[PDB]
């Protein structure tokens, strides 16, 4: 047993979303194993917050239309499904968006609380054209993983909610694209070692070293069933 | 364009194409979510902005 | 209200199902390549 252990040596941020990360040093042959395992876990099982229930005033169903806006209500629900939120303390928050006047409705117009952070201040939602038009929606942001859709969440929901709350599908995973590369490591005495260059592309809400730490804990606690029991 | 549009596209007409009487601005009716003959959804959405 | 005679109670209700895509639907290109979508894989695989 002449093995070693890797560390996160350099974490460069190319932008706020697209960001690479190294891993050093890996043993011979381990590079594609850890890279593919961290790819599968980091694409399947990461926790991220997303829009779940949207509550617009004076709008019954989602296939209607509204006074003073461009996008229709299905377009508004799609543009809200693309939203990227980052809460800290709670696991279920309610935001508020109120705006009148002619012009587009950015995501930066939501009257934020203290522990919610909207990381895309140019995300467009509506295009208010009438100056006498108003829009007051109340969003609900849960936190989970995977993909849970409206059909399954049509009876799963236990907390008897009132009628009038539009149900938006939940795209919870904040990782969208991940690639790993097994280079040749620059070790001063070893030539048979390699580095793993994971190139993540996030939703802006997840911190990459935190994501890698959580995926590593998921893999270790899954392998403990092999380690302890037989 | 005037673009009330929630209900209808309202187009102000340039003077060369515009009749002397009947001052006139064209108000297009958008057919929103309704039944087709094959139970699909025929729906019209405006692809022009305001003042364009 | 305005309609013909004979028929008395005339209530028409318009549902709108939203069908997504699922194992068993039929997709096709423009060239004659028919297909019944078999497995809806995860993103990772």
Outline:
The PDB classes it as ribosome/transcription/translation. Chain A is α+β, with helices and mostly antiparallel strands and 230 residues long.
The shape of chain B, in one word, is elongated
Query: What Rg of chain A is obtained from the alpha carbons, in whole angstroms?
Result: 22 Å
The count of helical stretches of chain A stands at 3
Structural class of chain B: mainly beta
How far apart are the first and last residues' alpha carbons of chain B, in Å? 6 Å
Strand count, sense and barrel status of the largest sheet of chain A are: 5 strands, antiparallel
Q: What is the CATH topology classification name of the largest domain in chain A? A: RNA Polymerase Alpha Subunit, Chain A, domain 2
Major beta sheet summary of chain B: 2 strands, antiparallel
Spatial strand order of the main sheet of chain B: 1-2
Content-based structural category of chain A: alpha+beta
Subunit structure (chain C): The RNAP catalytic core consists of 2 alpha, 1 beta, 1 beta' and 1 omega subunit. When a sigma factor is associated with the core the holoenzyme is formed, which can initiate transcription.
Function (chain C): DNA-dependent RNA polymerase catalyzes the transcription of DNA into RNA using the four ribonucleoside triphosphates as substrates.
Protein name (chain C): DNA-directed RNA polymerase subunit beta
Family (chain C): Belongs to the RNA polymerase beta chain family.
């Amino acid at each position: 047993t002449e093995f070693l252990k890797p560390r996160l040596v350099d974490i460069e941020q190319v932008s706020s979303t697209h960001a690479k990360v190294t891993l050093e040093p890996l043993e011979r042959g381990f590079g594609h194993t850890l890279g593919n395992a961290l790819r599968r876990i980091l694409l399947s099982s990461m926790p991220g917050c997303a829009v779940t229930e949207v509550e617009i005033d004076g709008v019954l169903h989602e296939y209607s239309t509204k006074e003073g806006v461009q996008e229709d209500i299905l377009e508004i629900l799609l543009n809200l499904k693309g939203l990227a939120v980052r809460v800290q303390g709670k696991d279920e928050v309610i935001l508020t968006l109120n705006k009148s006047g002619i012009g587009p409705v950015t995501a930066a117009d939501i009257t934020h609380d203290g522990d919610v952070e909207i990381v895309k201040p140019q995300h467009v939602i509506c295009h208010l054209t009438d100056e006498n038009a108003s829009i007051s929606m109340r969003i609900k942001v849960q936190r989970g993983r995977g993909y849970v859709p409206a059909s399954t969440r049509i009876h799963s929901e236990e907390d008897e909610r009132p009628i009038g709350r539009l149900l938006v599908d939940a795209c919870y995973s904040p990782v969208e694209r991940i690639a790993y590369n097994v280079e040749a490591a620059r070790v001063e005495q070893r030539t048979d070692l390699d580095k793993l260059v994971i190139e993540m592309e996030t939703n802006g809400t997840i911190d990459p070293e935190e994501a890698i730490r959580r995926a590593a804990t998921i893999l270790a606690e899954q392998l403990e069933a092999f380690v302890d029991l037989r | 364009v005037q673009y009330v549009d929630a209900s209808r596209i309202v187009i102000k007409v340039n003077e060369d194409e515009m009749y002397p009487g009947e001052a006139g601005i064209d108000i297009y009716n958008l057919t929103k979510y309704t039944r087709s003959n094959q139970n699909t959804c025929i729906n019209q959405m405006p692809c022009v902005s305001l003042g364009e | 209200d305005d309609l013909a005679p004979g028929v008395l109670k005339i209530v028409k209700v318009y549902l709108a199902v939203k069908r997504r895509i699922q194992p068993g639907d039929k997709m096709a290109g423009r060239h004659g390549n028919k297909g019944v979508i078999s497995k809806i894989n995860p993103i990772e695989d």
